[PDB]
């Protein structure tokens, strides 16, 4: 269900082109004639409002925005009951006869597991996890448990529900912790970091994506280079510049990945320009980054403007370490900013204690604040040193 | 966690990247 999830994701916010939502809408109507996508489109209008929420024919009666092409016509309306008879009335009667004839054990479990995948395309989630629970008691080895954790993971992928799905994803590994091969051991930890990207835990969850996407891909939902853009942007985002030379710019998979398609423009254009300390050509590569990468990708657009605040402070911080004092004519008259427009970027970063820099408003001499031998031994020691008696007397003064 | 959530506005990408286009044309 990645095709309808990735392409129709442009229905959230697209400020670039109008045909982006139109071209992606063709894949929605093409894939829905085979398998039922109806519960996916119903949630699109129930998530974001006053943008695309008025395009549904029957939810409430509304017409708005630019898109008349996403809807259920009189054909799919009559096909709504046709798919329900095949996915419920037809399948449940065949499995019910298996319990009466008592044929096999794991074969009956795989029947409920395969049937449980149809409930994801139905839109009733109470019977989705119920059928998986019936096959849970019939599951013996780890072969039948592979598709169980995949169907449960689709509940948060297909319905975009990060609340009730993460409880079931953790319940499988917590009740019985085995993992089998290290391939699945990374799968239980991958789904853990997916729901943490919705709450935006930053480098905690995002550090596992660059490791998993550079080794193995499920290959069933998508391809290797389609979701590779998630690890390309978060690669330089989470990892410091010191380790970018031994990891990102030199990699067996990444250097062969840029030759597959030009839609990345991260591990190549942004990495080489950042390692060369040249910000003249580095910034125009960011112009095609957010547009052609962050917006179309799902988990990347969940952040969007959350990337730059961490990245914009870091790109200048690395330049301040290479010189004691810089010049305003280098920043204002050359690369990324003008004179007056510089106050908007570094103006809000310093009061947040993100970086320490000094700009001269007369002679135009940029000055860098260097802690020298102070560092965390003196100043930062006082800050985090007060937490010793703060956390001790918090619950300690009340005894029991 | 939640402090980073609200403090980020609609500014930056959609805005500052539109300024970088006209900035290089004036130089």
């Amino acid at each position: 269900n990645y095709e309808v999830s990735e392409k129709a994701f442009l229905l959230t916010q697209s400020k670039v082109s109008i045909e982006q939502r139109k071209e992606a809408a063709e894949f929605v109507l093409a894939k829905i004639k085979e398998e039922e996508m109806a519960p996916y489109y119903k949630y699109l209008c129930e998530e974001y409002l006053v943008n695309n929420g008025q395009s549904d024919l029957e939810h409430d009666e509304k017409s708005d925005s630019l898109n008349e092409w996403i809807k259920f016509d009189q054909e799919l309306y009559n096909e709504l009951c046709k798919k329900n008879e095949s996915k419920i009335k037809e399948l449940n009667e065949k499995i019910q006869k298996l319990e009466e004839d008592d044929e096999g054990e794991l074969e009956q479990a795989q029947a409920w597991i395969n049937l449980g995948e149809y409930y994801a395309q139905i839109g009733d989630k109470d019977n989705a996890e119920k059928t998986l629970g019936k096959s849970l008691s019939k599951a013996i080895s780890t072969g039948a448990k592979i598709d169980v954790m995949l169907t449960i993971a689709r509940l948060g992928f297909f319905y975009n529900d990060q609340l009730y799905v993460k409880e079931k994803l953790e319940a499988v590994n917590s009740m019985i912790e085995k993992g089998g091969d290290w391939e699945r051991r990374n799968r239980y930890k991958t789904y853990y970091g997916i729901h943490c990207l919705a709450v935006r835990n930053f480098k905690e969850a995002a550090k596992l994506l660059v490791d998993s996407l550079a080794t193995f891909t499920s290959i069933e939902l998508t391809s290797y280079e389609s979701i590779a853009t998630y690890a390309s942007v978060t690669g330089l985002f989470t990892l410091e510049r010191t380790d970018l030379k031994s990891k990102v710019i030199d990699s067996p998979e990444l250097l062969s990945l840029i030759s597959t398609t030009a839609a990345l423009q991260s591990i190549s254009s942004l990495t080489i320009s950042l390692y060369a300390s040249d910000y003249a050509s580095y910034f125009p590569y960011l112009l095609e980054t957010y547009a052609n990468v962050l917006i179309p990708c799902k988990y990347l657009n969940r952040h969007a403007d959350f990337f730059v605040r961490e990245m914009r402070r870091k790109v200048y911080a690395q330049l301040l370490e290479s010189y004691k004092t810089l010049s305003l004519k280098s920043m204002a008259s050359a690369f990324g900013v003008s004179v007056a427009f510089l106050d908007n970027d570094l103006g809000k970063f310093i009061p947040n204690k993100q970086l320490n820099c000094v700009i001269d408003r007369v002679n135009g001499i940029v000055e860098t604040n260097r802690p020298d031998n102070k560092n965390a031994q003196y100043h930062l020691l006082v800050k985090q040193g007060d937490g010793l008696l703060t956390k001790l007397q918090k619950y300690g003064a009340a005894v029991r | 966690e939640n402090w980073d959530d609200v403090e980020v506005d609609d500014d930056f990408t959609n805005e500052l990247k539109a300024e970088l286009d006209r900035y290089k044309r004036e130089n």
Binding site: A276, S277, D278, S322, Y323 | -
Partner: protein
């Protein structure tokens, strides 16, 4: 034209550049950049760019 030669070109470019810096860095620092470019033999913008990279 050769990639293996061009790959070692930047390697030998920095190799002889670091060797020229060892003559500058060995005595005391705080010398004018204008006199540094005369010892290196490149432009002021090129010397400041390559020195800050190391």
């Amino acid at each position: 034209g050769d990639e293996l030669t061009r790959s070692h070109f930047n390697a030998l470019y920095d190799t002889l550049l670091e060797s020229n810096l060892c003559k500058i860095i060995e005595p005391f620092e705080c010398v004018e950049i204008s006199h540094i470019s005369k010892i290196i033999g490149l432009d002021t913008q090129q010397v400041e760019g390559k020195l800050s990279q190391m």
